């Protein structure tokens, strides 16, 4: 038994790579070999060893002739570029035994395309005709790629999501890249080329592990021809692979609603407990029958509920959920998702407001109405998914998802008078939706700066019973919970004192006060000027401290507060507080070696205008070597350029 530790169940590329390895090993001589998940890895049972497997792939492995005239992938297309032609010519000018299938397939597809007699490209009806001809002229080893990439249908074509627009993205195809990688030996992987989700420091010329890509495309072929329509209702309607439903952003976290709304599809990949041979996997991945029962599982939540019911059969231990998300652009990425569960939740109480006047029920009751096309039913399904996700995970982006689906529903209903008649006027909801919903004002930036501390300890350990190890759970004990109520300055002062005490007891000389969702000089000025809303800042900070912090929300900022109303005393005192690392980076004359804030300074600041004068005298004396709001402002995290600006002044 071989452990393919280069493969973990994620990303989707790795799962497909495992399937491709198993498929190739089985098909080519080792038919009854078996392949199952274990140890965060794929397991293979075969009479190949590691060395036999490597020799197989290096010296004998015939790749599947992935060539697609149904898109720009046969090697013969009007719109294209030179490298692809050079590649295809080199492959056609082969006579190697390993390349024979590619030559035959390319010749056949060229002949079919010529038989189309095109100007530049064929149309949808012509696409179906071309697919039929290719099916009638290809051979056994090619047809799995045809079945995976494209469909033959009664009324209109539709493109399976796993391979984009039919093995194609935009106006170009995966087959040319596949060929180029082979000779060296779009939508492919977020682990290599994902949207901004992790710490920075990477660059490449659109590079990918070539074996990963090849084996991924090889494994994608196990998704078979039984991707039929849901014979439901009475007009042309849903087509999909097995295990396919649209995605919901429960547990997504490092994802934005601008990508959820256009999400192409969601696919649930089974994981299983014992070695499984290829034909059983073909049955499993061909049927994947989660499509039934008149209120169809259009989206992921119904799939999850079926899993909970064991409606998705046992033997499959788990499903790895993947969402094809549009990364605010022209491309879709197969984003993996981590797992959360239905349980008690304070933000879930928000949903009760939607139950006022029974609105939600009425809306749901209206959704089936077929005079509203499948769109209304799909929106109702999406709303149910978003609400269940809100119950599962208390996160501002889930609240935003619910609000966005509600807005889309409202727009759709506004376009339909008959539907407008069927639901009574909406009940009043409470302001807590908004406060949990998106915020990004000066209040929000100050709150996120205060909440987004990253010296190990999150701000939660002060505002709530929290510990850094479990940031969205009933966590272990980090005992700094000294927060309070009402106006924000006193509670921030208490947090500063407790952080200084914790630093002294840990003996952290550099105060743990660095934050990485910072405010700005304008936000700090608005706070200091006496005009910003303190209470909303406090509530937003408490909310933001609740969970594992996401990559970042869509930031949409606002202008600074300044009209001859921004003091210098803040600049005089700030260098005494800033994390020493940062300060040392900062020009300030003050020492570099780290420091627990000069002993008496916070108390003097809290002692009022006379106390502020004493604090200024003390700061002057140390640098040679009104209060409360000023202290709270001094706590706010901001970046080094502001400190440089201060020093210049």
Author numbering: 9 to 193, 227 to 666, 682 to 705
Copy text verbatim from the article accompanying this structure deposition.
The large subunit of type I-G systems has no detectable sequence identity to any other Cas8 protein. We predicted the structure using AF2, which gave strong support for an extended structure with a mixed (α + β) N-terminal domain and a helical C-terminal domain. Thus, structure predictions suggest that Cas8g is a highly divergent member of the Cas8 family with a C-terminal Cas11-like domain. A poorly defined elongated density that runs across the belly of the Cas7-crRNA crescent complex structure was observed in our CryoEM reconstruction. The density resembled a bi-lobed structure with a larger head closer to the 5′ crRNA end and with predominant interactions with the first two Cas7 proteins. Using multibody reconstruction in RELION 4 incorporating intrinsic motion we were able to improve the overall quality of the density to ∼8 Å resolution. The enhanced map enabled us to model the Cas8g subunit using the AF2 predicted structure as starting model. We separated the N- and C-terminal into separate rigid bodies and using DockEM we modelled the overall structure of the bound Cas8g protein. The Cas8g subunit is clearly flexible and consequently is observed at only low resolution. The N-terminal domain of Cas8g sits a considerable distance from the 5′ end of the crRNA, and this together with the lack of a Cas5 subunit represents a significant point of divergence from the other structures.
